[PDB]
Design a protein around this ligand. Structure first.
Ligand SMILES: [Mg+2]
Ligand SMILES: [Mg+2]
Ligand SMILES: [Mg+2]
Ligand SMILES: [Mg+2]
Ligand code: NA
Ligand code: NA
Ligand code: NA
Ligand code: NA
Lengths: 1014, 1014
């Protein structure tokens, strides 16, 4: 037909009109399956009325919707490939995914999008049974289509949809025919809706969530809401189920709502349709509210995710079932009382993380297995909350969070970050309809999920009146959940929770019109009474999460600081393939996407393959649910659980002397929620030998859980106990070029022109490929770089200050190199000055004392100019000629730890393969540091003292000059960096200096001593 | 083109889709004229860039949009008539206007409308100058089109619009061509928008407001808001003018905002574009806010409508004017403080009325002359506020209210009264977009008008979440005005003001879920702190406004009772024409409209021709701005003005004895706002003659005003002063049939079978056409009938109770008729029983004493059964044979007054033509009563006593059995009803019993005496 033709359908350009967000789309509603059997519904068995169209579809790509041929509406194109649906077509190579953070991927001219609008033409030929078309309603459900789409069925135009992150449903009953049918879906990458979808993520497109057919009866359940009300002590609950119907009303129709705990019916209710009178015209004849009483309900929480099963049966008075829907019900109350967010009467402490729907191979297509993997890892690392950054998630997500026990912030798909000002659209009433659909349809879909405890109005869209309106709309329709929104300063009228992004613990960031106060200060501002939960904090970009412990100290000290959501869970890297077929991880700009925000897509605690970064352990430790205090030999264990007794926890303790165990034991934990348990340690040993005693306690979960295996370690702490302080002569040969010291089969060679230990021999085997030289620089971290780019320098970034000061180009100048034979040792004294453009940045004065035992004692005293940027490190580095399989050390470990991220590390004797001493951050940087190290063993070498170290096959130079980890090549031998001092890594944010003063190397004078021996 | 064709344009049926409220419509904005001269703008002179297309258009009517021929898009139809635009096409006879109140005029199946959808095809061929199309933007403005419409220009489809009551603007620049152009407008009577337009009014359609062309420059003023901020005492003001631009930004662009008081520039400000930073992305580069200081501003109020002129000039830095817009600015603050609505720091007392846009000949087309007439009448009757029931009004309205001084409630065009429940749509998020457009676009249009002091979210649409959302939206965008909304119980979260409809003063109406408490009680409900202003009260349907004084006593006694809006200003009657070309007033059902709400369209204080009903005077008296208290000979005059001194008022006083003046005088009023003035009266006379002294004071405005002529009476009061109490024999001839009494040339004849005075002779001329008989009934008022209809009886209505009790059918039974000659008089004693179906309702026992002076003294004692409904009246009626030109009476007058509506009437000697004793209510009923009457003179007849009376050419029977006033025919002679007692008329509402107990004839025994003589 003429009006079904592309030429007509496309003429109005509905994808460039925010007044048209949909055409012929059905109302939003909770998940439906149209069970015709109540036991199936109760048991969540797969309904035959819900059919999946996921699988092999036909796909053709076009540069613009105009280029689509009319024949596509009737027959599959010859040029059409077979592709899997759901999928993003950028993952199939048709065009490039674009990583941009704030800047829109298109020209900013709303509501218009580029004429070159990549278009994906999907089609599916399928069979429909005669019974479906004989009676009832057959709808098609698109759980996600990015960004917009037109839908044809058998050549006839059905409808149009936007909002990539919520389901779009269309009635096909009048379009289907018994037997073979063809769907034709034209998906546009850009639409007016794209102005509300400016999230900091990969910009992709396609039918990336499930496609289904649902068959319902003519007389059907159209919507149903569950609410739970409680008494003062949660001993009595009322489940209020409001059920709505569509179709023909009849006095024999009945609704039965039954509530099940496993196989046990705990409550039930039956009633005819017809609600109570609500205004002068009457009530809803097509609605009914059942009120079921539940005595001593088992309450839902992230700690104990007790769930009931609500089955909603639409049937006849004589008992014939018309259809059945069902939901998981969690009995919990979420409310803000006197400035505190309470769940079931107790103040929450949100151990949260932001999570994008990202898969390195399938992009933004989510599968159950990846969701479960994420949830398990999160709970195993002491997360209890997740923020749907920044859009409604795949439906299954919420179910899993109901089942496994995670608190969820459900967020509308509204982000206009790229607008100038940020609220240009959100303050414009012409965009209120569009925004409304993104909020309302989210609530209507997800309001029955107990896991969802907070609604969010979106992200980074300023503060406009549309936010206030939709805030109030949510509050009116669902007063069971707080609403939050960070835009416009994080404390606007459109949020019940002060929810700033990257507000620091103690440091104010007074930005014009939207300051980021210190969270502590923020709570106390005149007139402010709300709780404060950071929607984003602790930016985990690369080697980061420095200063995380400061946040958690504050969270625990301040009642109204109820936590936050780390940014973020998983790196948004994508897999590309080398010429040799090898996969490597790619970030912004690696797909020809331009402009792009290069590696800012990788802010995760875990790699895209869900392998953890070191920072994750820090989080786990700071978020652990058991806090410990040592008093003498008494351990006070305090529980931060609100609801569960410690019924699956035992405390293992161990006392060790310089890594050697001396005593241990196990004590079952029996501590009530928010309670204390005192554990008296038996008299620990009094080792008369020298060294520091260390007490380490670990809470172990002996039995498996739904989310953890037996023996899971959930918490730990370490304290220093008592310390007992410790109470042949080398031959020197002097030449014009070097001092040579010989002792047995050991030989040291100091170059007199450079002033450095230039070679060491054991027997005849050289030990150094590069001299032992002072190092004051590190391969910059993403936090060091910030947003600085070779084209657009950011002068306040640490890397730019270091480069401008000449730290990387500083030329060592020999001031002194002298040798002297003592009674039993040889003493080499050196002094160097590092200079740049006439200024002396650093002066190092060293002494090397080589004694009759072969031990070389190195004393290093460094002066740092007060006016030069504080150096990243003060230490030594050399390239060792040997490559050994393993690294042994007495120090903090086992994982990478830095001065502002080492609380989770434990002091012990650690022994790891050399590879585990390199952290493969996709963007290479300084990595692998271990701090608090008293002994390091590598090959025949032993270093002793009190130092930090990293050891790898990659130089700091190579790390600094290589953009991707897959481009690194192991160099000859092994690079050893031994630092007396190392700067913090930061992480409060990764676009401004974030290293706190106490972790900057600002003392001006530094001293450290090493002992190097065989 | 194919896509411009009706077949394509109409295929999507945008008028049955609430997701499509418009296509290609431009943003809403304040009134624009695009002056290219700043003096013109200042002087509000007509801009040549604003051209009117009002005038002769071509029009063709069709029963459905499908029936429109494609040729219409290119050339005018042959069948097309020439019609005036603006117009409603029901007023041109093409189809019928439908009067329905609650029930939708279409089948209720949203969003769908009937397939038979009357369609009006308008077209206009006009000329466009070349300059308009050479550069700049040419838009077409439709200030009102009911209900929806598609727009073509020169055969090409431009756009689509809904919301009949706000302007719809479209850019024609790309469609126009130098010289001759043709607009084609297809207007649909029904659309999805019609579900939001269920106001209790005539349902009409067409282009009923102005159509204009506006030419603006490419670089233009796109929006501008004015705000006024004040200090604690309103001595200093800041005018904050936010100006927005569209087009190309350039650093030489400037905005100048100048403020004028007549010809005097009081303030000015210039600035480049670029607003302050508002969020992280910056500010609005295309906006600028000027902040002008005004010292000692002249404040705007309904009492003193001081206005400034704001001229907004968009120009270059070097001084070239690009364009100029302008507005009237009123400096006033509206805010609710501690439960009180304050204007400029003073609590308002709203003397309000609801006003529909209605004209009896042109329907819903409004002209300036009618608006001015209405405003003048309102102010002359002591109204200071108007509610735009129930939609945004013609723009000019607001301007006039700014100029003349009326407070305005601006109301969104949202009424869903016919839905079941009433909030079915307003609680549905799918209708939130549509509703939003009706609210937002109202605010954007009218927010600069000082007269608008309150926003309303609509009317009779229940309470749904959409209301809460839009309430909050208004509060966010314009916090300068309170928002009110009555739906959902009048005290919901969506209103700042308790704004009930027809809540009574002392009587509760406990309806389920939406009770109408007594307003006094309502204020004091636990937790209630808001002010209470009735959005509708005192239903002026016909002979009504009984009990109005109770409302105003309450308003004055209770601070938080700040008044209300009477329902309503003007009868919504329409003019039809008899076979003889005579015009008559018509109401529901007179156009074949069915179903219809017959006469409920006529609820006005004035007739459709703006002739006043009697009730208006009552309102004027109760709303008067001067209150009086008498103490001895001292009059305390209290001013209820808040802002103005009584600078144009003098008090005239007069003392009169039984209507004869004895003394008078004038005293200038000099009373401050809310102040008191004591006026000592000189020693009033001590007339030793008999009778009651009456003091009457009137406030006269000696000088003309913009709204009143010289000598205007604005207030009055009357008190009783001292009273000095007053300290030939007829021949009887008895026959079997009658007693005959003769005295000189006077003869009385009493029938002994009936027991009534059956004839009276003066000389040989009979005086009676009908005997003098007791009357206990009245032709029912609309308040007596309520909603009762012959098909659907309402048993609690007074008329139905009276009919069921037999009051109208009661048969008089003679119990006694006897005659007796006294010393100097003849005494006739009678006793009658009125009976129905065996029950005696009334018993009348009378004595007629005819003495030697010709005077017939009648004593009447009536017993009323306690269990029969209280009778409407207790009196006598006769048909007098004579017709005299005038009626003289000593009593309350001059206008119709009833026991619960007589405060405004004054006791005096009144003399009016007989016609003025009949009030021509379009729906006939009891009318013309004058109460407190001590003397009545008609022809040679004089009646004396203390009675109420009406006198007319129409019997109560005829009034009762005639549906329209034009169908009344004067009967032979004159019907006189003399009542000892008369029931109240009611009026709190006209669909339930509203006569308060103290005005019901419930005493069971009544006595009254008359003296009838020559
Ligand atoms: Mg659109
Ligand atoms: Mg962003
Ligand atoms: Mg529509
Ligand atoms: Mg109504
Ligand atoms: Na806290
Ligand atoms: Na990022
Ligand atoms: Na009052
Ligand atoms: Na009415």
């Amino acid at each position: 037909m003429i009006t079904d033709s592309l030429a007509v359908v496309l003429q109005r350009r509905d994808w460039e009109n925010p007044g048209v967000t949909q055409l012929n789309r059905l109302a939003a509603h909770p998940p439906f399956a149209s069970w015709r059997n109540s036991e199936e519904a109760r048991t969540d068995r797969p309904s035959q009325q819900l059919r999946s169209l996921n699988g092999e579809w036909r796909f053709a790509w076009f540069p613009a919707p105009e280029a689509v041929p009319e024949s596509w509406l009737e027959c599959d194109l010859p040029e059409a490939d077979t592709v899997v649906v759901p999928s993003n077509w950028q993952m199939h190579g048709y065009d490039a995914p674009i990583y941009t953070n704030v800047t829109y991927p298109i020209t900013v001219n709303p509501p218009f999008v580029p004429t070159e609008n990549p278009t994906g033409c999907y089609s599916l030929t399928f069979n429909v049974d005669e019974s479906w078309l004989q009676e009832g309603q057959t709808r098609i459900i698109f759980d996600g289509v990015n960004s917009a789409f037109h839908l044809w069925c058998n050549g006839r135009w059905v409808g149009y949809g936007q909002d990539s992150r919520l389901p779009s449903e269309f009635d096909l009953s009048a379009f289907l025919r018994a037997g073979e049918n063809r769907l034709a879906v034209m998906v546009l990458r850009w639409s007016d809706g794209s102005y509300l979808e400016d999230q900091d993520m990969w910009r992709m497109s396609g039918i990336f969530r499930d496609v289904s057919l649902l068959h319902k009866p003519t007389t059907q359940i159209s919507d149903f809401h569950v609410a739970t009300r409680f008494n003062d002590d949660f001993s009595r609950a009322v489940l209020e189920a409001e059920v709505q119907m569509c179709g023909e009303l009849r006095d024999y129709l009945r609704v039965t709502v039954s509530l099940w705990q496993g196989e046990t019916q705990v409550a039930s209710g039956t009633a005819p349709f017809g609600g109570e009178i609500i205004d002068e015209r009457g009530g809803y004849a097509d609605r009914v509210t059942l009120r079921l009483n539940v005595e001593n309900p088992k309450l839902w929480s992230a700690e104990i995710p007790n769930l009931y099963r609500a089955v909603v049966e639409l049937h006849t008075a004589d008992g014939t079932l018309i259809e059945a829907e069902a939901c998981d019900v969690g009995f919990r109350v979420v409310r803000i009382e006197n400035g505190l967010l309470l769940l079931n009467g107790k103040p929450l402490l949100i151990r949260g993380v932001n999570r994008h729907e990202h898969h390195p191979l399938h992009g933004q297509v989510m599968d159950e297995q990846t969701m479960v993997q994420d949830i398990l890892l999160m709970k195993q690392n002491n997360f209890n909350a997740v923020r749907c950054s920044h859009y409604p998630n795949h439906p299954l997500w919420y179910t899993l969070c109901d089942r496994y026990g995670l608190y969820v912030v459900d967020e509308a798909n509204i982000e206009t970050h790229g607008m100038v000002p940020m609220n240009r659209l959100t303050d414009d009433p012409r965009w209120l309809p569009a925004m409304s659909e993104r909020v309302t349809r989210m609530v209507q879909r997800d309001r029955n999920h107990p896991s969802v405890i907070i609604w969010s109005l979106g992200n980074e869209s300023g503060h406009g009146a549309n936010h206030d309106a939709l805030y109030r709309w949510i509050k009116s329709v669902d007063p069971s959940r707080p609403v939050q929104y960070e835009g416009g300063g994080a404390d606007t009228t459109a949020t019940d929770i002060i929810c700033p992004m990257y507000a620091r613990v103690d440091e104010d960031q007074p930005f014009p019109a939207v300051p980021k106060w210190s969270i502590k200060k923020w709570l106390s501002l005149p007139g402010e009474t709300r709780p404060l939960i950071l929607c984003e904090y602790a930016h985990a970009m690369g080697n980061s999460l420095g200063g995380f412990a400061k946040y958690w100290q504050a969270f625990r000290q301040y009642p109204r600081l109820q936590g936050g959501f780390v940014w973020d869970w998983v790196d948004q890297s994508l897999i590309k393939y080398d010429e040799n077929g090898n996969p490597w991880s790619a970030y912004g700009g690696d797909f020809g996407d331009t402009p792009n925000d290069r590696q800012f897509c990788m802010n995760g605690l875990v790699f895209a393959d869900r392998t953890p970064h070191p920072a994750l352990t820090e989080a786990k430790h700071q978020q652990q649910f058991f806090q410990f205090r040592l008093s003498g030999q008494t351990i006070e264990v305090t529980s931060e659980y609100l609801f569960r007794h410690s019924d699956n926890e035992l405390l293992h303790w161990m006392v060790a002397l310089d890594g050697k165990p001396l005593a241990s034991g196990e004590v079952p934990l029996d501590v009530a929620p928010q309670g204390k348990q005192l554990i008296e340690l038996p008299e620990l040993p009094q080792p008369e030998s020298a060294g520091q005693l260390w007490l380490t306690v670990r809470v172990v979960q002996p039995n498996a859980t739904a989310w953890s295996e037996a023996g899971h370690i959930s918490a730990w702490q370490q304290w220093r106990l008592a310390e007992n302080l410790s109470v042949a002569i080398p031959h020197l040969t002097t030449s014009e070029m070097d001092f040579c010291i010989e002792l047995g089969n050991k030989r040291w060679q100091f170059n007199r022109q450079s002033g450095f230990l230039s070679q060491m021999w054991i027997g005849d085997k050289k030990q150094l490929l590069t001299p032992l030289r002072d190092q004051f620089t590190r391969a910059p971290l993403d936090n060091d770089i910030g947003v600085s780019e070779a084209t657009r320098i950011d002068p306040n970034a640490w890397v730019e200050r270091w480069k401008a000061a000449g730290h990387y180009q500083a030329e060592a100048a020999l001031l002194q190199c002298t040798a002297d034979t003592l009674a039993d040792a040889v003493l080499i004294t050196t002094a160097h000055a590092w200079q740049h453009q006439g200024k002396t940045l650093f002066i190092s004065r060293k002494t090397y004392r080589i004694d009759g035992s072969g031990q070389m004692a190195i004393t290093v005293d460094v002066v740092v100019a007060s006016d030069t940027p504080h150096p990243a490190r003060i230490g030594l580095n050399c390239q060792l000629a040997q490559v050994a399989e393993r690294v042994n050390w007495l120090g903090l470990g086992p994982q990478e730890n830095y001065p502002d991220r080492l609380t989770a590390a434990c002091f012990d004797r650690w022994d790891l393969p050399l590879s585990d001493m390199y952290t493969p951050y996709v963007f290479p940087s300084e990595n692998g540091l271990r701090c608090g190290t008293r002994e390091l063993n590598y090959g025949p070498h032993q270093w002793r003292g009190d130092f930090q170290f990293n050891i790898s096959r990659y130089s700091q130079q190579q790390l600094m000059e290589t953009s991707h980890r897959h481009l690194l090549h192991a160099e000859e031998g092994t690079w050893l960096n031994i630092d007396g001092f190392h700067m913090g890594i930061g992480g409060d944010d990764s676009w401004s200096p974030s290293v706190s003063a106490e972790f900057q190397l600002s003392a001006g004078r530094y001293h450290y001593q090493l002992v190097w021996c065989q």
